[PDB]
């Protein structure tokens, strides 16, 4: 029997699914959520042994511990212990597609544990074992005797162990299979691992027990009165003395309580459920749950004899909230939600897919700190504790079934097969059975990338039957099929249609209004954050705010799925697809997060935070209008801090108490500002500061900001008259200017500033030259590879046209002696195979105060693929410790991703000017820069720049960040114009036209001086 | 408010309307033409496609392919091998749908739809032709004067502008070449505003109160320098209103031994002034030529937010077609995306917008009825590196879209002025 190769067999001897149990025997412990003596953990040191296949496991391992076995920590993924490789593959299955068959070589984990059971647990009641998650299929033995079998990697499997255990020492043996027929339904874009990766536990329940319970809360039109409806199932012996009391607690107060015997309403010709009871509790003015305000009550479910003896108690957190679609909108408590969401896999760089409380909390606090209100469980039910934390901290959760069949052809081959309905149902139904009582969960999802099959319709309807209180969503088969209450596309663009056959991705704006369509639109996945990305994010949020039925979306995704490996020296590095000898693989496509694997923020997270603000600001005169995008809470923990600065120099600051009702406005008059006589640009900056700390934030947390240009006074005053005059020298192969200790050299063969001097110290290591290329971002590369080119990708369009091997031919290099200046004039052409790609024209005018004014004018062929940049690069000799700039900052900011950035005077160590993306590329650019300081050097103008110890050549030649070695001196890329980064997706050109360098003619000017 | 004058003469707007309302849409990939019929009922049984490829105005190859497109359907026309010329310039494809037979409503050979793509472009690498002549600089107390052969340029050291030009003993200018940041207000510029009831939101009023119109150019810098084979004039001005600096023009004039005056303008615009209507220069010429011949978007009047209709090519028109007779006189006759403009002996090269006529902006803004307009001495020429949008969504509130406002803060352009 090969149950792992049979989709008609997804379990044996497995107990029904149900919400979380603890079997409290004290009701007060149930109320407070204190640990239960009846809930034991079996986590800890276990014995493990790896085999190539289940045929290779010896018969003796059932009765006796294997001598070769090692002691390992459980929960764990055996790949993280290095028993075999983890495989990163996206769409293409890690195994041959041949359902229901798996390879004969099927890596096999043999876990075992010897553990102690107290005698009392066997004298009465039932003792079950709980495996919160085993990947992907297992058989269980206890004391040599076979217990059962189980599949579904991401939901718990429980087994009654009563008849198997003896008082004292018992032995579990778990044979875990890496591949099974269940694998075909677990094809998510992530690392492919295996083991007992979630918690293991023992649970004692009495013979007479609570077997299930459902909490539903329905409301009146204005939410002044609620009814909590608790439905309770029992197992065991039914007698007339049996009662159930459900009581509802606001902290330490009991607001309501109901008591009833068993025997529900009549439901058909045959009677009622003798073993069931429903209790209704009236709750006047109930405190409402939301992400803004996670008000929670406690429901204690007491099974007892009518004369007072408690049999057991179960409990849950209850959040009074109503989810409904009405008139095309998703409403929470009668108000239109705006989903500031993200997709979060369960990933840890060290522990693999094992989740722990600390990680979970770090994540939640980070999400809330960055203006997220919602999370999608991509693409499986999570560790049960995740839902508890979301209930309490306040996040909207999309709970998603563990079904992804992306690798099939066509994508719905299994989901449209009635032979896979049994398998798929288990995965939907057991999720809902487990999680339906969590207030945080607001939407059910049928799975991920599995086409649209009839099994999706059947299962869609099943949920709507069992739980009318949540909407159902599912993206497969075009985002708007009959198996979804929500239009939930992935990577639909804001304005640009993408008219694929069968499954188009319409512009989200356009999607809402298609004939006969009325559903709300919330993107299940958008703004793919792979490497240097999130360009065009403000575009989305402009739309979300403008269109009522565009109700936001979930960013893809939260945390890079990178793993730590060690080298010869034993030093850690970040690893991705292929780095474990795993092949075939999909390389760095496993790292698409707003944060690194160690939860260090990418720069992109700040653009998310800014656009997802709950406060909007308008300015008119010296009057600021603040609008609250909150639906429920007043801005109680909010004050506004405003400052005025002239080119970085502050001139007036101050704070005003914010008292803005939800969806209301407040007007704030500025004090008459002192207008400066000094020349430059006035800038207003406001910040919302939270003075009080919270569960999720520290004191003085900044939640929102915004900038305006105020009055601008232009510099009329001419530069002071320098009495000196630069001396020009003309040799055959050099133009040499001289003033004081300052000295410039121009090479007559190449046409570039070849060297510079202050004193007799060199300033340059490579000459100052033009640059029209960048180290390709993940967005520029897409799905293109050395062996399988994608000619569409930005990197490949560049390569082919010859941008990277453009050879600079000289057309002119002359010198001229002005009244009080020396004027070098240069012109270049960059060509590839007869075709002139670009043309550069430059004047360098060095005056009497040592200042050199570079004027650049580039022509770009209209038929050449647009350039990544138009600017100048050189290798500075100076290795300074600090970078000081008047510009947009403080963090890396780009043309299509700079809304969060603020204009001011910025100062940072040189290491902060480099963003350590695991796959090296162009990074660290600052835009909107009027002035740049680095040691002796200063550049003025209006430019974009990046300053690092890594050349664009190295960053383009290096696969991993840890393989980057610092070069001599400091590479400097000053750009007059830079292309967008994009990232609507990362498999097709995503940079929007207005951020492309398509003007054909470009002009910028720098002044290089010494201070 | 019409697309035609009361006599049924088309306004320039009617061509933009015609072009956008076309019943055929086109896509180009490689050298295939994808034709999509937006008809719902008829086939294209009275339709033909004329295609032609031009290098900066010179036709290289033309051809006409028959159209058989069903309603809502597509046709794929594979073009023949187009000739890639060595010559430097911009290749353009132009396609036209032509109705070969007369209908109850149209003449035979009626044009129903058109579209242009840039094809290949070859950038000029080869050097300018050799010049051994060298312009001679004269420096008087209050004039900079350049001289080459019979050509004489005169820069006023007091005002800062090119004050006069001579070809032989002939005056070329009737006013000095100055900067212009204003335009004669259009109807979309005035809105509901009146001199008796001011609407402060209207563009014209924003410009007025900011002093855009009465701005005095106060010179900051006017130096001159001699190079190996050129004279470099370098100027800098600031248009101020009541202590407030609104614009700053910084120019460089480079006359060389071939006869051509290269102009480089860099303008700063204050962020807290209303965005300027234009950024270019104006002069009253002396010559009155008969024909305007330009390489750029044409032939009819076109603006940055109204120019899909216009095609790039070589257009030659009588001077009077370069003026649009709106009953209420305003800024008009502009042609966008120009690389060359020819007027009498003059020629301007580069990349700009232009309008040319006998009517000063000052007169057009002071004249309420087109019949009251008197033709002035010489020819007023407006050359803008940049011109604001014209709007139209409505005419009682500002309707110029963000992308067609001149908000950038810093603008640059370059112009070659020669004789032929
Ligand atoms: Mg099976
Ligand atoms: Mg997938
Ligand atoms: Na919305
Ligand atoms: Na991915
Ligand atoms: Na790289
Ligand atoms: Na035809």
Q: Can you characterise this structure?
A:
The structure is cut from a larger assembly and holds 2 copies of chain A. With 1011 residues, the first copy, chain A, is mainly beta. Chain A has 5 domains: 1-206, Galactose-binding domain-like (Jelly Rolls, Sandwich), CATH 2.60.120; 207-321, Immunoglobulin-like; 322-612, Glycosidases (TIM Barrel), CATH 3.20.20.80; 613-718, Immunoglobulins (Immunoglobulin-like, Sandwich); 719-1011, Beta-galactosidase, Chain A, domain 5 (Distorted Sandwich). Chain A is built from 12 helices and 60 strands. In chain A, the strands form 14 sheets. In chain A, strands 49, 50, 51, 52, 53, 54, 55, 56, 57, 58, 59 and 60 form a 12-stranded antiparallel beta sheet that branches. In chain A, strands 1-10-9-12-6-3-4 form a 7-stranded antiparallel beta sheet, with no helix packed on it. In chain A, strands 32-31-30-29-28-34-33 form a 7-stranded parallel beta sheet. In chain A, helix 3 (357-369) packs parallel to helix 4. The longest helix of chain A is centred in the middle third of the chain and has 15 residues, at 421-435. Chain A is globular, with a radius of gyration of 33 Å. In chain A, 47% of the residues are buried. Chains A and B meet through strand 43, strand 50, strand 51, strand 52 and strand 60 of A and strand 7, strand 13 and strand 23 of B. Bound molecules: magnesium ion (MG) (2 copies) and sodium ion (4 copies). The site of one sodium ion has 8 residues of chain A, from helix 12.
């Amino acid at each position: 029997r090969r149950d792992w190769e049979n989709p008609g067999v997804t379990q044996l001897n497995r107990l029904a699914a149900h919400p979380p149990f603890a079997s409290w025997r004290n009701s007060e412990e149930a109320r407070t959520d204190r640990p239960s003596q009846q809930l034991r953990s079996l986590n800890g040191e276990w014995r493990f042994a790896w085999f190539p296949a289940p045929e290779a496991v010896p018969e003796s391992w059932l009765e006796c511990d294997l001598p070769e076995a090692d002691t390992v920590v459980v929960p764990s993924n055996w790949q993280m212990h290095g028993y075999d490789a983890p495989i990163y593959t996206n769409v293409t299955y890690p195994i041959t597609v041949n359902p229901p068959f798996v390879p004969t070589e099927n890596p096999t984990g043999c876990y075992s544990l010897t553990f102690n059971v107290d005698e009392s647990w066997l004298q009465e009641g039932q003792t079950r074992i709980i495996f919160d998650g085993v990947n992907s299929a297992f058989h269980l033995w206890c004391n040599g005797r076979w217990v059962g079998y189980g599949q579904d990697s991401r939901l718990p499997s429980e087994f009654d162990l009563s008849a198997f255990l003896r008082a004292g020492e018992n032995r579990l043996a778990v044979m875990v299979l890496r591949w099974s027929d269940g694998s075909y339904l677990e094809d998510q874009d992530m690392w492919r691992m295996s083991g007992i990766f979630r918690d293991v536990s023992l649970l004692h329940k009495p013979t007479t027990q609570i077997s299930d319970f459902h909490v539903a809360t329905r409301f009146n039109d204005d939410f002044s009165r609620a009814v909590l409806e608790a439905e309770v199932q029992m197992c065991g012996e039914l007698r007339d003395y049996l009662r159930v009391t459900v009581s509802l607690w606001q902290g330490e107060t009991q607001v309501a309580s109901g008591t009833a015997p068993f025997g529900g309403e009549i439901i058909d010709e045959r009677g009622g459920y003798a073993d069931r009871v429903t209790l209704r509790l009236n709750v006047e003015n109930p405190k409402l749950w939301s992400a803004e305000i996670p008000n929670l009550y406690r429901a204690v479910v007491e099974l007892h004899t009518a004369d007072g003896t408690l049999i057991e108690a179960e409990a849950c957190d209850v959040g009074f909230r109503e989810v409904r679609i009405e008139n095309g909108l998703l409403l929470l408590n009668g108000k239109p939600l705006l989903i500031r969401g993200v997709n979060r896999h369960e990933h840890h760089p060290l522990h693999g897919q094992v989740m722990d409380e600390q990680t979970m909390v770090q994540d939640i606090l980070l999400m809330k700190q960055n203006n997220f209100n919602a999370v999608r469980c991509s693409h499986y039910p999570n560790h049960p504790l995740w839902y508890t934390l979301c209930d309490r901290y306040g996040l909207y959760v999309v709970d998603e079934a563990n079904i992804e069949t992306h690798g099939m052809v066509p994508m719905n081959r299994l989901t449209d097969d009635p032979r896979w309905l049994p398998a798929m149902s288990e995965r939907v139904t057991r999720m809902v059975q487990r999680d339906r009582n969590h207030p945080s969960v607001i939407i059910w999802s049928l799975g991920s990338e599995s086409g649209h099959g009839a099994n999706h319709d059947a299962l869609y309807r099943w949920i709507k039957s069992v739980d009318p209180s949540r909407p159902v969503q599912y993206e497969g088969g075009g985002a708007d099929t009959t198996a979804t209450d929500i239009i939930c596309p992935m990577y639909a663009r804001v304005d640009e249609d993408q008219p694929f056959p069968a499954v188009p991705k319409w512009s989200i704006k356009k999607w809402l209004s298609l004939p006969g369509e009325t559903r709300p639109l919330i993107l299940c996945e958008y703004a793919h954050a792979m490497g240097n990305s999130l360009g065009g994010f403000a575009k989305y949020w402009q739309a979300f705010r403008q269109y009522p039925r565009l109700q936001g979306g979930f960013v893809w995704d939260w945390v890079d799925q990178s793993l730590i490996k060690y080298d010869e020296n034993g030093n850690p590095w970040s690893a991705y697809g292929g780095d474990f000898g795993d092949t075939p693989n999909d390389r760095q496509f496993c790292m698409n997060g707003l944060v690194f694997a160690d939860r260090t923020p990418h720069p992109a997270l700040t653009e998310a935070k800014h656009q997802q603000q709950f406060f909007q600001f308008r300015l008119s005169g010296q009057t600021i209008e603040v609008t609250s995008e909150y639906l429920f809470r007043h801005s109680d923990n909010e004050l506004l801090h405003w400052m005025v600065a002239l080119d970085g120099k502050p001139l007036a600051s101050g704070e005003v108490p914010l008292d803005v009702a939800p969806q209301g406005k407040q007007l704030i008059e500025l004090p008459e500002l002192p207008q400066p006589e000094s020349a430059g640009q006035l800038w207003l900056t406001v910040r919302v500061v939270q003075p009080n700390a919270t569960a999720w934030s520290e004191a003085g947390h900044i939640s929102a900001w915004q900038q305006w240009r105020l009055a601008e006074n232009l510099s009329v005053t001419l530069p002071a008259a320098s009495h000196a005059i630069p001396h020009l020298t003309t040799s055959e192969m050099d133009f040499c200017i001289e003033l004081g200790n300052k000295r410039w050299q121009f090479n007559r063969q190449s046409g570039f500033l070849s060297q510079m001097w202050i004193g007799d110290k060199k300033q340059l290591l490579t000459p100052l030259r033009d640059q029209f290329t960048r180290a390709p971002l993940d967005n520029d590369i897409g799905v293109s590879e050395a062996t399988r080119i994608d000619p569409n990708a930005w990197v490949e369009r560049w390569k082919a046209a010859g941008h990277y091997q453009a050879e600079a031919a000289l057309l002119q290099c002359t010198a001229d002696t002005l009244a009080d200046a020396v004027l070098i004039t240069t012109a270049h052409a960059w060509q590839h195979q007869g075709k002139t790609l670009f043309i550069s024209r430059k004047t360098y005018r060095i005056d009497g105060s040592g200042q050199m004014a570079i004027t650049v004018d580039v022509e770009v062929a209209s038929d050449t693929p647009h350039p990544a940049r138009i600017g100048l690069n050189c290798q500075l000799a100076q290795v300074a410790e600090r970078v000081n700039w008047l510009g947009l900052g403080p963090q890396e900011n780009y043309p299509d991703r700079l809304t969060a950035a603020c204009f001011d005077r910025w100062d940072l160590p040189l290491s902060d000017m480099y963003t350590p993306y695991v796959f090296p590329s162009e990074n660290g650019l600052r835009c909107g820069t009027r002035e740049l300081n680095y040691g002796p050097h200063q550049w003025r103008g209006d430019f974009q720049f990046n300053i690092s110890r890594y050349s664009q050549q190295q960053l383009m030649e290096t696969s991993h960040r840890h393989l980057l070695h610092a070069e001599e001196g400091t590479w400097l890329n000053i750009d007059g114009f830079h292309m967008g980064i994009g990232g609507d997706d990362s498999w097709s050109p995503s940079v929007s036209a207005e951020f492309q360098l398509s003007a054909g003619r470009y002009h910028y000017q720098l002044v290089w001086c010494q201070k």
